[PDB]
Amino acid sequence: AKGKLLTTPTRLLKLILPLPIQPLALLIHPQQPLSYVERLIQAELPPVKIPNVYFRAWVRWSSSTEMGDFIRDAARGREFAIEIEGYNIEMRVSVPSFGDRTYYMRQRLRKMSSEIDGLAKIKHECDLLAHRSAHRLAKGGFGLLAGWWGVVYYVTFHTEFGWDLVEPVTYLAGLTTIMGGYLWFLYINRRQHALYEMKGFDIERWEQLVQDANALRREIRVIAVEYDVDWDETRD
Amino acid sequence: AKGKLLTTPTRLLKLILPLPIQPLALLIHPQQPLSYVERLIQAELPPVKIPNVYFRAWVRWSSSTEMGDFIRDAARGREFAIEIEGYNIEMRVSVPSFGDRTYYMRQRLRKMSSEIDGLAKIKHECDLLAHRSAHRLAKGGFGLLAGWWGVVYYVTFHTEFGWDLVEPVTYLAGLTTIMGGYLWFLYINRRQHALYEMKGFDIERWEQLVQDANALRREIRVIAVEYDVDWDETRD
Amino acid sequence: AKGKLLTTPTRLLKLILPLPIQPLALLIHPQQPLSYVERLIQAELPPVKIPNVYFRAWVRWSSSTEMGDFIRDAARGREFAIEIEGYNIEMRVSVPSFGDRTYYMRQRLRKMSSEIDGLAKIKHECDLLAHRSAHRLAKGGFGLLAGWWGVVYYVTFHTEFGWDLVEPVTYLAGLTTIMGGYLWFLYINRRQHALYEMKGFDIERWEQLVQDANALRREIRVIAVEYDVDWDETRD
Amino acid sequence: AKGKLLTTPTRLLKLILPLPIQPLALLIHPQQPLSYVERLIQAELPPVKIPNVYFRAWVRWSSSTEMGDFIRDAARGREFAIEIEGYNIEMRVSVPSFGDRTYYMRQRLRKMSSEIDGLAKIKHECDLLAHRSAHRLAKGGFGLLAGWWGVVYYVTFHTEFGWDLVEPVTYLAGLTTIMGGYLWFLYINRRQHALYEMKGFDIERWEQLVQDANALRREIRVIAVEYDVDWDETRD
Numbered sequence: 001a002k003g004k005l006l007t008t009p010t011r012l013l014k015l016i017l018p019l020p021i022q023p024l025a026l027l028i029h030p031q032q033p034l035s036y037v038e039r040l041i042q043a044e045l046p047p048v049k050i051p052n053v054y055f056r057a058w059v060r061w062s063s064s065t066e067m068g069d070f071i072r073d074a075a076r077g078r079e080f081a082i083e084i085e086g087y088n089i090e091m092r093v094s095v096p097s098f099g100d101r102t103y104y105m106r107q108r109l110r111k112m113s114s115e116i117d118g119l120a121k122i123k124h125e126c127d128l129l130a131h132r133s134a135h136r137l138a139k140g141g142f143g144l145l146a147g148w149w150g151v152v153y154y155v156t157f158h159t160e161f162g163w164d165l166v167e168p169v170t171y172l173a174g175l176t177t178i179m180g181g182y183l184w185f186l187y188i189n190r191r192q193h194a195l196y197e198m199k200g201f202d203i204e205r206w207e208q209l210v211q212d213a214n215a216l217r218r219e220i221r222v223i224a225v226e227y228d229v230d231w232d233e234t235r236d
Numbered sequence: 237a238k239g240k241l242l243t244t245p246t247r248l249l250k251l252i253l254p255l256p257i258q259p260l261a262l263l264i265h266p267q268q269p270l271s272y273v274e275r276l277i278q279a280e281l282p283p284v285k286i287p288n289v290y291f292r293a294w295v296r297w298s299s300s301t302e303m304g305d306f307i308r309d310a311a312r313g314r315e316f317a318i319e320i321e322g323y324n325i326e327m328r329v330s331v332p333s334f335g336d337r338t339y340y341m342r343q344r345l346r347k348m349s350s351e352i353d354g355l356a357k358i359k360h361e362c363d364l365l366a367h368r369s370a371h372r373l374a375k376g377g378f379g380l381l382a383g384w385w386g387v388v389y390y391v392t393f394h395t396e397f398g399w400d401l402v403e404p405v406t407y408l409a410g411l412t413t414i415m416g417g418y419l420w421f422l423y424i425n426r427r428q429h430a431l432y433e434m435k436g437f438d439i440e441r442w443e444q445l446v447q448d449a450n451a452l453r454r455e456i457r458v459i460a461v462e463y464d465v466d467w468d469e470t471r472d
Numbered sequence: 473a474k475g476k477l478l479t480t481p482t483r484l485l486k487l488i489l490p491l492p493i494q495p496l497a498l499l500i501h502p503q504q505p506l507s508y509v510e511r512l513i514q515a516e517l518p519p520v521k522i523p524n525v526y527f528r529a530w531v532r533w534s535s536s537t538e539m540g541d542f543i544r545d546a547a548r549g550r551e552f553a554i555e556i557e558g559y560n561i562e563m564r565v566s567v568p569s570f571g572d573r574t575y576y577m578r579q580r581l582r583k584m585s586s587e588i589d590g591l592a593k594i595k596h597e598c599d600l601l602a603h604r605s606a607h608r609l610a611k612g613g614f615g616l617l618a619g620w621w622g623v624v625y626y627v628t629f630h631t632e633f634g635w636d637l638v639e640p641v642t643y644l645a646g647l648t649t650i651m652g653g654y655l656w657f658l659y660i661n662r663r664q665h666a667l668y669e670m671k672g673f674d675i676e677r678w679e680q681l682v683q684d685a686n687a688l689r690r691e692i693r694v695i696a697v698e699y700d701v702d703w704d705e706t707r708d
Numbered sequence: 709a710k711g712k713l714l715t716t717p718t719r720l721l722k723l724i725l726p727l728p729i730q731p732l733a734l735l736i737h738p739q740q741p742l743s744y745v746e747r748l749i750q751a752e753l754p755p756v757k758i759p760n761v762y763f764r765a766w767v768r769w770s771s772s773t774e775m776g777d778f779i780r781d782a783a784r785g786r787e788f789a790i791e792i793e794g795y796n797i798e799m800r801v802s803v804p805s806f807g808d809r810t811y812y813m814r815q816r817l818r819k820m821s822s823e824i825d826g827l828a829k830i831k832h833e834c835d836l837l838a839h840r841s842a843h844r845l846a847k848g849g850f851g852l853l854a855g856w857w858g859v860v861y862y863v864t865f866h867t868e869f870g871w872d873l874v875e876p877v878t879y880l881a882g883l884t885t886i887m888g889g890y891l892w893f894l895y896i897n898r899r900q901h902a903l904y905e906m907k908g909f910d911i912e913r914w915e916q917l918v919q920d921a922n923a924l925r926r927e928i929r930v931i932a933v934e935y936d937v938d939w940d941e942t943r944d
């Protein structure tokens with residue numbers, strides 16, 4: 001008495017019809033027109049000298065509409081139907097809802113997003129580690145700076161040596177600091193990448209997952225514009 | 237003895253031809269084959285015992301070719317012909333060039349590009365707004381520098397202290413500047429986001445517009461390769 | 473009463489089934505419809521007056537569906553069935569999972585990836601070759617710096633000239649260093665290209681391998697979305 | 709007596725056959741199999757109870773080969789042929805050569821490359837302009853440096869003033885040079901972009917043309933691998 005329409009992962013639609021007890025089943029690309037379906041069911045139906053077909057939302061549509069708009073309208077109605085010249089019976093067919101279409105896409109999104117959440121925990125933890133290390137180092141450096149400043153002040157202004165004996169000291173100090181920085185540049189040949197490699201985090205995979213998930217979300221919002229809006233991502 | 241088709245913006249084709257007051261009007265989807273057009277015309281035409289329709293460019297064409305490919309391969313001559321078996325009439329029909337497709341796409345593209353130009357002008361304005369603040373602060377810095385220069389010149393020549401009391405202080409001063417700058421970075425570890433939130437600007441919408449425009453340009457250029465090349469985006 | 477098909481690496485399918493010593497073997501391209509398979513089997517089978525073949529998953533399917541879509545929608549059950557009108561035999565046939573397609577693609581992918589790993593190891597070696605040269609030169613620079621430091625220390629404390637003859641010279645010296653470095657840039661306005669030309673390395677080939685590998689990964693992941701997801705590239 | 713095969717810009721092939729005086733003409737996607745053509749010509753031919761078809765290079769091929777490999781083989785032969793069960797007609801058909809296929813692609817390449825050559829002339833000329841300007845400036849700077857060095861030497865070592873009156877001079881000089889550099893940074897708020905904008909050169913268009921042309925070259929070399937190699941780009 002009834003038929004069905006179903007969604008596939010490969011953006012094709014799977015029609016099922018109680019056509020002669022033993023139902024027929026078809027695959028339709030959404031950009032195709034309904035005349036494809038009419039021709040194909042004519043091939044599936046018997047002669048009578050060829051039959052005629054009509055698709056209906058109570059209105060009948062033309063045979064040159066793309067499947068997508070027809071389904072938008074039928075989801076507005078929640079079901080559509082078919083009329084044939086000979087059998088004289090209205091074959092009603094159900095239609096997927098929004099979630100009925102976005103099921104596979106949202107499942108992929110949930111898997112990818114849980115993986116990304118784990119990766120984000122990893123990255124955040126090790127980033128804060130490196131953050132604390134660098135800031136402890138900077139605190140020590142500022143301490144050295146303040147010590148040097150107090151030294152030069154209390155020496156030049158409150159010591160019998162004077163600036164005469166102090167300029168060479170601070171010049172040698174500046175050159176030794178440059179030598180230390182140079183030795184450090186060569187000690188390199190930033191630390192976050194080594195923390196990743198030693199911890200197991202990956203970046204190319206990370207951005208790959210993120211990019212795929214963003215394209216997914218954009219397709220979701222596209223269909224949510226076409227279909228009913230307000231799909232509550234946090235609810236999924 | 238002549239007709240023509242027309243390009244709607246809905247990826248359909250509105251064929252208009254004389255079918256011997258209101259001439260024969262037909263809606264077509266491009267993926268349809270010519271056999272469906274044949275049956276459609278047969279439905280529109282009177283009896284004879286049904287005639288067989290031929291399409292031509294001469295050459296005789298089949299009945300399974302999609303419309304789009306036939307039109308592409310026809311546009312080198314600007315017209316294609318029909319031969320009905322019954323009426324013995326010569327009929328020719330106009331091929332749409334790149335111009336009509338270009339029209340109903342470029343209109344969307346120009347709307348999008350003008351909107352994007354406005355949005356980018358707004359973003360440019362607010363960028364200038366923050367930039368001039370930073371510029372004024374750097375002007376103040378230049379003023380401080382020149383003040384320090386004049387100070388040390390005065391204390392050198394127009395003073396009895398002499399260079400002996402000058403070199404130490406300024407050195408300490410220089411160190412303090414570094415210290416100050418150092419502290420600044422140490423205080424860091426974002427702002428224009430808030431300036432746009434207060435301005436009421438949309439970045440996701442902007443980027444979506446840009447990417448849609450680029451994709452539509454690519455579609456236009458593809459179909460321009462299908463037809464003759466050199467559609468001259470900058471000119472039109 | 474059972475058969476199976478197989479996946480060659482040429483985007484064909486080798487069907488093998490019992491057609492009542494050498495069972496019925498058939499080559500298929502996926503874009504073909506099931507009607508061609510029906511006529512092919514009819515040619516292979518004996519007379520009766522020709523029978524009509526049905527395909528099933530229950531559901532009865534049409535005769536225009538491409539093979540690939542039918543297989544995709546069949547793989548949820550791992551088998552699909554045939555019903556011949558004459559013989560009254562029940563026949564079932566095995567659906568290939570993701571594994572066979574994955575096999576004849578992943579083999580190419582692993583070959584490419586291993587070759588790329590070797591090439592990248594070579595490039596890494598030669599990069600290290602130049603890097604160590606630069607490193608040794610910087611070590612020489614460190615030595616010069618420490619020599620200058622010890623020189624000025626000696627002339628300061630272990631010398632009667634005193635700081636008065638020290639500060640000017642070193643200042644000039646520092647300037648000359650800048651001048652030297654300045655001249656170096658002025659002499660500039662490329663080298664590893666020659667090192668690879670002498671090594672005999674191929675960069676265009678390398679990049680082509682990389683891009684082909686990435687595109688083939690994307691194809692695999694697409695067809696993995698078509699079937700069940702999570703093919704785990706890093707694992708296998 | 710003879711037929712033809714022709715190339716389209718949209719990677720589809722245009723078959724033309726002397727089939728019933730009034731030739732037939734078909735469009736074939738290269739990845740399709742020859743069984744598509746067999747089915748379609750069966751539909752174009754009369755009954756006899758359906759005819760059979762054979763494609764031949766002297767060998768006959770299967771009806772499940774993709775069109776590309778068949779054409780590779782026929783270009784090895786420079787022509788192929790068709791046989792039918794009832795007509796007993798050896799319908800020989802010609803095949804495009806390498807250039808016969810790459811004609812449109814190479815024409816696009818020539819246009820794009822001439823445009824790019826003009827753009828490259830522009831860029832090279834204005835780049836050399838900026839180059840000369842910057843190097844004249846650097847020569848002047850080096851001259852100032854040498855003047856300063858000679859000044860400080862002949863003053864501190866051959867003038868009655870001495871270092872006592874000179875250190876303040878060069879300190880003030882360094883601060884004034886920093887002030888001048890600071891004023892220069894603010895005079896900005898590199899020159900090649902302004903030269904482009906005032907001259908008319910464009911970059912996004914430039915890289916767009918280059919990217920499209922390189923992808924084109926890759927497709928050309930792909931088909932040159934499939935077909936005969938050594939196509940002599942400089943000859944085109």
Ligand SMILES: [Ca+2]
Nearest residue numbers: 167403639875
């Ligand atoms: Ca001094």
